[PDB]
Amino acid sequence: APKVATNIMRAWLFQHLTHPYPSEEQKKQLAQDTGLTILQVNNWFINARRRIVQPM
Amino acid sequence: RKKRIPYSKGQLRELEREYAANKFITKDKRRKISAATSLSERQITIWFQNRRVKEKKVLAK
DNA sequence: GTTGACAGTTTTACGAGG
DNA sequence: CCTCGTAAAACTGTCAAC
């Protein structure tokens, strides 16, 4: 948890498979509307890349 | 400073072919490889600097 | 099953100094 | 370029955990 958070950060990832990395300015905006810390977004994206992308 | 933007697994494949051939780069190949990989002539010049340290890291023991 | 998290180690990218 | 050291992004590697 939470849920919509995941649903937000999954939208950004599948939008760019090409360059699956945020700019620290973008992460700020993600942290700004998530409820999440900057650290959490980083951490999740770090996971999400090895969690999802590799087979793709 | 430039943000951390790591390299495609295909770009690191181009390097390490060259590094394994010669630990050092020619201004020719410093160009030739840069265009194919679309890396900056500056960046590719740094990669060997780091990659050189790595081989001293492997020193072991 | 996989989700979020972390210490520890690897990769990028400069700048001092010789 | 060139070690050498120093930032900071992003990778293992594993884990109780809810």
Residue numbers in the entry:
A (entry chain A): 279 to 334
B (entry chain B): 217 to 277
Describing publication, verbatim:
However, analyses of the formation of TF complexes on DNA have revealed that many TFs also bind together across the family boundaries, in a DNA-dependent or DNA-facilitated manner. Because the DNA-bound TFs are fixed at particular positions relative to each other, the contact surfaces required for cooperative DNA-facilitated binding are very small, and can evolve rapidly. We also generated an unseen test set by solving six structures that represent several TF–TF–DNA complexes bound to optimal DNA sequences. The structures included two BARHL2 homodimers with two spacings, HOXB13 homodimer and TEAD4–HOXB13, MEIS1–HOXB13 and FOXK1–ELF1 heterodimers.
The first algorithm is based on mutual information, which enables the identification of TF–TF pairs that show preferential binding to particular spacings and orientations relative to each other. This method identified 1,329 interacting TF–TF pairs, including several known cases in which two TFs exhibit a preferred orientation and spacing, including HOXB13–MEIS1 and TEAD4–CLOCK. To assess the feasibility of predicting TF–TF interactions using currently available tools, we collected a test set of known structures that correspond to protein dimers (MYC–MAX, CEBPD–ATF4 and FOS–JUN) and two DNA-facilitated dimers (MEIS1–HOXB13 and MEIS1–DLX3). Recently released versions of RoseTTAFold (RoseTTAFold2NA v.0.2)39 and AlphaFold (AlphaFold v.3.0), which can predict the structures of protein–nucleic acid complexes, performed much better in predicting the overall geometry of TF–TF–DNA complexes. In predicting heterodimers, AlphaFold 3 succeeded in predicting the overall geometry of the HOXB13–TEAD4, FOXK1–ELF1, MEIS1–HOXB13 and DLX3–MEIS1 heterodimers; RoseTTAFold2NA could predict only HOXB13–TEAD4 and FOXK1–ELF1. Neither program was able to correctly predict the contacts between FOXK1–ELF1, MEIS1–HOXB13 and DLX3–MEIS1 complexes that contribute to the composite motif formation.
